Amino acid sequence: TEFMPYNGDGFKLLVPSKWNPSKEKEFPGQVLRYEDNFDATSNLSVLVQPTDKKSITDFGSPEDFLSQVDYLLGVASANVLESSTPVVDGKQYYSITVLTREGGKHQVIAATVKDGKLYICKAQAGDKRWFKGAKKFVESATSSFSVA
Ligand SMILES: [Zn+2]
């Protein structure tokens, strides 16, 4: 109904059914981008980049990882609402929720390491759309992200 599964190269996730794919490359390693055409500040991207790390935990804690992929957030200020270290089907993931700025953005990052690749899912919405229904879309897309 409101969500549709997507299968990429080595990963899958749920994308909101009303968002559309964007052909524009915003970040390096970008392989998917979906956006709300009524408010393009609501969007999501999946990045796949090579790495020498063997685990997401080689990055240090969730907050340490966040500091190393901070280009993804563009910030006068970043506030970490929550972080977690969920394990899905054997794989360690990190998940981080960050609020950046009046003007506010809620960004959720989910990440794991597999096969000499760093796989990053980032979903965001603006503060007002967040509380008006976007929170569901942002959190499902990042919660649903899994690699194989
Ligand atoms: Zn907010």
Author numbering: 16 to 89, 108 to 134, 140 to 186
Which text from the study accompanies this structure?
As an example demonstrating the effectiveness of this new approach that connects x-ray crystal diffraction and molecular modeling with Raman spectroscopy of solutions, glassy states, and crystals, the present work addresses the high-resolution 3D structure of the extrinsic protein PsbP of photosystem II (PSII) from spinach chloroplasts, Spinacia oleracea. The higher plant OEC consists of an inorganic Mn4-oxo-Ca cluster that is apparently stabilized by extrinsic proteins PsbO, PsbP, PsbQ, and PsbR. PsbP and PsbQ proteins apparently maintain the ionic environment during water oxidation, and they control access by substrates and products, in particular limiting access by reductants other than water. The tobacco PsbP structure presented three unresolved chain segments, one of which was the N-terminus where 15 residues were missing due to partial degradation. This region of the protein is implicated in PsbP function because a 15-residue N-terminal deletion binds to PSII but does not activate oxygen evolution.
The analysis of diffraction data to 1.98 Å on such crystals is now reported in the present work. The structure shares with tobacco PsbP the same internal regions that are unresolved in the electron density, and, although the N-terminus is intact in the spinach protein, it too is not resolved. One Zn2+ ion is coordinated by spinach PsbP via the sidechains of His144 and Asp165, corresponding to His142 and Glu163 of CyanoP that coordinate a Zn2+ ion. It has been suggested that one or more of the observed Zn2+-binding sites might be sites for the physiologically relevant ions Mn2+ or Ca2+. If so, this common Zn2+ site might mark a functionally important surface of the protein. In fact the three-dimensional structures of spinach and tobacco PsbP hardly differ, overlaying with an RMSD of 1.07 Å for all 148 resolved Cα-atoms, consistent with their sequence identity of 78% for the 186 residues of the mature protein. The only region of structural difference, at residues 164–173, appears to be related to crystallization. In the x-ray crystal structure with 148 residues resolved, 26 residues are in helical conformation, 75 in β-strands, 23 in turns, and 24 unordered. Crystals of spinach and tobacco PsbP have different space groups and crystal contacts, suggesting that the three regions that are unresolved in both structures might be intrinsically flexible rather than affected by common crystal lattice features. The x-ray crystal structure of PsbP, as well as the modeled structure, shows 75 residues in β-conformation, substantially less than expected from Raman measurements in solution, where at least 87 residues are predicted in β-conformation.
